[PDB]
Design a binder for this molecule. Structure first.
Ligand SMILES: CC(C)CCC[C@@H](C)[C@H]1CC[C@H]2[C@@H]3CC=C4C[C@@H](OC(=O)CCC(=O)O)CC[C@]4(C)[C@H]3CC[C@]12C
Ligand SMILES: CC(C)CCC[C@@H](C)[C@H]1CC[C@H]2[C@@H]3CC=C4C[C@@H](OC(=O)CCC(=O)O)CC[C@]4(C)[C@H]3CC[C@]12C
Ligand SMILES: CC(C)CCC[C@@H](C)[C@H]1CC[C@H]2[C@@H]3CC=C4C[C@@H](OC(=O)CCC(=O)O)CC[C@]4(C)[C@H]3CC[C@]12C
Ligand code: NA
Ligand code: NA
Ligand code: NA
Lengths: 485, 485, 485, 485
């Protein structure tokens, strides 16, 4: 009698939502609003990423240009950080950067101009440095001394050194050439949503840190977006317009509703759970069951909770940046990215309503724990090889310098990548270390490819075999499916 | 009695054609004409592709030469599109292209000459552009203004600027140097089927679009094939001859006959099908069978229908191009390519007449659906990682700029390609995004290699196991094989 | 009674040779002489290959040097065949080669000298060539005309052109600069077995074939080994000595003996075979057995026959070259290589005397046929993709030019190699062909990795399962093992 | 009665240590001290490797700088060994190195100075060399003659040759420019544990060995660490301090204790073993058992013995180098590396106390022997291809020069790496060898990927199947587990 009521409640909880409408006619609003969330957050990421793509492309093209203009002897990809080994070359390159700053209106191409105005030279060298290696002696004050100078851009008189730059090269940490420029992007006039002007704050670093007769040279531009006061097109006045704000607000609306409903379904599942527990204990003195208790919990909803939280936070920060017109898009990108990932996994929630898809996702879920355990063991062997190869082959190989590069290399070697370059880039300056490199790599690659990938394949193959055998000959006993039957 | 007649008809429909001649002596003409089609379309593709290969090789060698002649500072592979960052270099390179156009008879090597005659300079810049970034202001007319000029090739007077080219560089979209040249290929005199002369229409694009202080520079030659009026060899007059036309016509003949016969066999299969249905229902009141209805349909014939249609269309377009002597071979190549692919699959029709080959092809066919479903699921996870990596690691990685490049990268990572370059080409300018790159790549590569390829292997392994078990212990019940037995 | 005699003979034929000495004490001479052959042919290949390695290293270092001396603007690896696009550069490079030939005693380093004497210029251009592309007309005599000239090396007067070289560039096929030089290798004085002096016959080819405004440039040296008349060391007279000849003769001895004994064992196996047949038929009227007839044949001996023949032939040619002192080592290398390969497989004959090794080699042999059949089918699909990708993506991809390069690429893609470079090196000049490239590559790589490698793994896994089941539960019935039991 | 005592002893020996405290309350000190050893040796390797990393980085940056200063025309990565092909270039480069040595205080950047003083030129050429290749004759004295010279660094008079260097280039083996410099590292003042000053002993080798008109050029610096007499910071006197010594001593303490206890447990296991043997024989006349005898031996302890020995030796050598302040870290690195590897495997000892981990490690151990046997067979086939490809494709391929490079290549090809570059880097100068290259590579790659990796997967899959079946249906009979039960 009442047992029948419990069977009705439970089966109503275990039936698919599409099955909860063919039988009892409950309108599936939850599926609809989730689908809305999926397409919504997707479109959000797409538009936001296209905008970022245009802005970043503008920035990258610009900084490449500034490198080819201000840095002498720059080559595409010299790690984007070439070095100089001679005093006269340091002087020639500083002079090159300055003279190319003062002729920027005559030599360059783009829409570049000045802050409207100074070019900041900045020496950074030790307060007291007296180094005598020929006598095996030195006296240092690690506290830092600074010097500076400003060239007004309207001074074409000086352009046989002219400016008063003089160096020591015994006490020196870095020279910095700091200045600022302004430009405009013209692909963005077609889209009012983007600010048009852009501020560039450039610094050229001549780094003599890590004294080795090798001065690193780098350029870095830290930028600032700005909204123009006004801008015309064919006589028509125009200012920047915002409509993405309302879109993001509607994202927060949708994800908030989904959050509320999902929490309601979780709490309902827990109340129904304890109801089952207390009812089952009371009626027949039997209730030491834990797996069924988990079966009432549904991790997918939890995935949607984490997803909704991350979408809301990322959207608030997004609105903040589009309002203040900042250019630092790093946290929102990650929150929204992870969110989307979890959302599409939600669609994999919306493929398990088929028994064959159900077979496959259940195979994956059932396999995951044993795979993680075995990844612990193989991770232990992996760590062993990582320390060993790091300490032994660090000095004699381009890789293996840092433990991270080690892990990257060994991982790639498990997955076939870049073997002959590893065998070949080794130095034969020491023969014993070279032999050990060989035993290390043959033993490693053989052990992890020929024995262990094989065992992963054995695991997933075995789980597929079992759950196939369950969809043939029935699941194992649970005492809940018995009660439903 | 009549059931025996049905067994005779059906078994006559289920027996192999080689088996339909050892028993009843029906001459297999269909196999013969299909084989003729196979070798025919193959030889077609080979000859057509060799011709295209010669023409394309001539074009490519030529355009490489024109790049090294007219473009200053060209390097093999600077993406075939090098850039310039300075006004004086733009002037020097325009001047280089012009002076190398006017000295082309004295400096070059090949058989180059002129249209018999103008060198077209063409500026393309805004009608009204007034850009003041120093004041955060600009006024634009996005409508385009054009200017032009023509240098007669017989003007060696001008060769300290001489021509009247002057630029603004604030309003500018592109400069175009358009001209035309004529040449002859001499490997083709040995083959009358090919036209000998070739027209080249060259354009040099100095692109200042996407204003970033970086002017793209490209060369493009759009060509036109031409038949010479006449051409001699050792005193013997010769003009171009065509025999490939008859060949293509015979292709259309063969494929048309195959099309007709195959459609006849499909329609016969459908009439025999409904005959079986109505007969089986009428006799014993049993006919709710759908799998047997499909078993009367044979998809291979359909493959041959699509194949024949594509061969006929591609051959008509082929004859059209060889008649009009055009140089645009893109649609015919694809129709004929896909056609051939389907034809060789037809030969795989002509390997299933052996029970072991039959075991293997049946294994593949039986496995394909479940593989496509699982490719749907894993495609969902794949899309998640694609969006996430796109938005997060777009700005800080050379890959990941566009979703397509993302999908290409992740696909390559599933199949082992180019890992250490992905781990290594990342920028450490932001540490949090870098960590996230690591979790992203380790988690991704591990998840798709160590768990999912394994599951594909489990699927095909399982299907091989089953159908092996069927060729041992017999197929499952169908109620058609029962009637035949 | 007599059946027992047959059991004794047969079991004596089926027992291992080490088992034929523990029981009946037959001295295994065959194993000993085969082992002798293994180590013998191995040592042969090693010494012969080390010698070749020294000679080839000398040649390669030399030709690299001659490239850097005589070819202007040579770069390491410009495909070893750089091109020139300008007349004046052709003149400058010819002049460079000549002047660097006449100053070779003053500019160079090594032990270079002359034939003791001419530098051969050789033009090769059409007899009659009159090409007018501006009028779409041309008259040709494809017969070839030649001109020549000789610069005596002792003419420093000429060194503003001096020599009388003049070109047309409309009729021209190739210019050839042919000459000869002599040198000595000094690593070989330490080894009397090698001739010390070396002759180099150099030709520089300026190839204007395939008229495209691009003249290929290559250097080729065809060499000739020579034995010096005499050579001293510290006052001691020395001439080249040969002892490798006797070694090779002893190789021919060993391999000949093995050949004889193996043929004797094959013929004995055939006589014993027909004896079994006739005896089995005569006694019980039962003899329609073919598998047992094969079981008396042993393919390993055949492998040793082919091996011995190839070792003898390669050794005769080897002795011929060491006698005549030629430098063409291409056929002997291949005969000896294949021979050695088959010999080490012979050692795999000498590992099947263990039941576990026996399990594995039997697994491999039992799997091979079905693998070859399935490689036929998958080869058909492979050919389809090869033709399609060849014709479609030939013009728009650096690969896919020739069917061989296609097969190499697709093979590499099956085995994971070089994906992102294939996706990325495609040209977006045509969007439809680009899309088709994508469907082509995703479909291909997915089909051959995710479904077919899986099936190979299923095959070998299945065979291992079966033969495991036979070493557990006994082999199947043969009616020969029944008679032995 | 007494059998019960034996069951108690044995089960006390077979129970886990954590199980030997939940039941009988034996304090597990061994686990604690081993864990201490794990973290200890780990931290040791980390600190030691970071120090080495700083020192090696300093050295590498330095030698790169010296290359760019003293070697003319040096390029990043010209194999770090560029060559010269002309006399005048040899003179120009020697002159460059000398003049850049004498201006080192004016041209360079770092903290470089002199020994306080000579620049050593050293010719090495034959005593008697008279080579006449034009007459096919030569007379040699392979004994070596040497010449030398010293330029005082304080001689700016000479800087139109000035120094008296003259060469022959017919008799010559090598020129050596040897000198010494002193420098200081400043990242190390922050760490008193490291000596600050560094000695560099530089040699430039112009190698004319292997006479081929190609002089190799290399730079090599052999260094010597030195402790400065004193060094100040902001007026505070400072000398180098050592605390790592005590740490290493405590390593030796821990590993020694572990060594002692482990040997005690092994010997106890052997005494208990023979006790079981003699007792089992005496009581029931049954004792021909060998597997149980091994089951009393535990290889993990042995792994810890080898580990402890290697840690102690490496630590003694470590203390020796930190005391004497040497810079040769090659043996200690390897001993400590292998040690750590074995230690983390020890942690895999500390994961087998779980039955699922136990399933996996037992799967791996049970699979290893058959994998090694099959690696013997496949190694035989591998050797065959190695010899064949070595001798045939040595001269015509960049790889395949040496047998080691062969093995590296073929190994990479088994694991997918670098196929299209192997197919493509072959020379078509000989067509037969090229075809053979194709059959070689297709046959090889197909045979080892499509058939043999498959069989490894079959092996590990089979072992997983079996031991799964044992943890389901119980282990096989041993007659020891019977006695315990
Ligand atoms: C191969 C499959 C079966 C499992 C592989 C496991 C890896 C994905 C994980 C497991 C633990 C990780 C390691 C845990 C800790 C570190 C220390 C970490 O230290 C550093 O930051 C290096 C520089 C420094 O020492 O400061 C470097 C990465 C590394 C080796 C990690 C690299 C990646 C590892 C090996
Ligand atoms: C990994 C195996 C198990 C299945 C992987 C599936 C892929 C072969 C397919 C399935 C769906 C495809 C995606 C469907 C839609 C798009 C959007 C498409 O959008 C663009 O054109 C990018 C530029 C733009 O946004 O305009 C980019 C390719 C992409 C990600 C496709 C890439 C290739 C995908 C992921
Ligand atoms: C992928 C596995 C399952 C089987 C793959 C089979 C390949 C190892 C073989 C089978 C047949 C071979 C093909 C047979 C014939 C030719 C024609 C041959 O024609 C040429 O010589 C190209 C130049 C010309 O047309 O003259 C090019 C190689 C090719 C495609 C071969 C390439 C290598 C193939 C595809
Ligand atoms: Na790979
Ligand atoms: Na792989
Ligand atoms: Na790879």
């Amino acid at each position: 009698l009442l047992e029948d009521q419990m069977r009705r409640k439970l089966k109503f909880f275990f039936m698919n939502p599409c099955e909860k409408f063919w039988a009892r006619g409950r309108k599936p609003w939850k599926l609809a609003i989730q689908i809305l969330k999926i397409a919504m957050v997707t479109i959000q990421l797409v538009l936001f990423g296209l905008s970022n793509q245009m802005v970043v492309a503008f920035k990258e093209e610009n900084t490449v240009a500034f490198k080819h203009l201000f840095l002498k002897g720059y080559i595409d990809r010299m790690d984007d950080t070439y070095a100089v080994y001679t005093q006269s070359d340091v002087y020639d390159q500083i002079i090159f950067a300055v003279n190319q700053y003062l002729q920027l209106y005559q030599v360059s191409v783009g829409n570049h101009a000045y802050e409207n105005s100074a070019m900041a030279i900045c020496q950074h060298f030790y307060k007291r440095g007296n180094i005598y290696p020929g006598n095996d002696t030195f006296d240092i004050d690690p506290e830092i001394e600074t010097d500076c100078f400003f060239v007004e851009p309207d001074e074409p008189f000086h352009i046989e050194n002219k400016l008063n730059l003089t160096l020591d090269f015994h006490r020196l940490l870095t020279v910095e050439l700091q200045f600022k420029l302004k430009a405009i992007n013209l692909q963005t006039v077609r889209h009012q949503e983007l600010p048009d002007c852009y501020d560039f704050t450039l610094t050229i670093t001549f780094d003599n840190k890590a004294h080795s007769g090798r001065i690193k040279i780098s350029l870095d531009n830290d930028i600032s977006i700005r909204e123009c006061k006004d801008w015309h097109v064919s006589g028509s006045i125009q200012k920047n317009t915002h409509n993405m704000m309302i879109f993001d607000a509607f994202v927060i609306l949708t994800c908030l509703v989904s959050l509320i409903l999902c929490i309601r379904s979780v709490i309902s599942g827990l109340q129904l759970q304890q109801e089952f527990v207390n009812f089952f204990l009371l009626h027949y003195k039997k209730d030491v069951s834990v797996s069924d208790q988990m079966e009432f919990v549904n991790g997918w909803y939890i995935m949607i909770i984490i997803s909704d939280i991350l979408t809301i936070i990322g959207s608030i920060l997004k609105m903040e940046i589009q309002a203040k017109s900042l250019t630092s898009y790093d946290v929102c990108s990650i929150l929204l990215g992870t969110s989307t990932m979890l959302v599409w996994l939600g669609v994999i929630r919306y493929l398990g309503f088929f028994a064959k898809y159900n077979l496959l996702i259940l195979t994956l879920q059932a396999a995951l724990p044993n795979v993680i355990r075995f990844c612990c063991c193989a991770a232990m062997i992996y760590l062993g090889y990582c320390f060993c190869g790091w300490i032994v082959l660090g000095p004699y190989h381009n890789k293996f310098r840092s433990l991270n590069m080690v892990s990257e290399c060994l991982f790639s070697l498990i997955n076939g990548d870049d073997m002959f370059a590893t065998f070949a880039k080794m130095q034969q300056k020491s023969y014993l270390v070279w032999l050990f490199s060989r035993i290390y790599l043959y033993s490693f690659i053989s052990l992890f490819i020929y024995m262990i990938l094989s065992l992963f394949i054995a695991l997933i193959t075995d789980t597929y075999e079992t759950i196939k055998h369950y969809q043939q000959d029935g699941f194992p006993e649970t005492e809940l499916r018995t009660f439903i039957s």
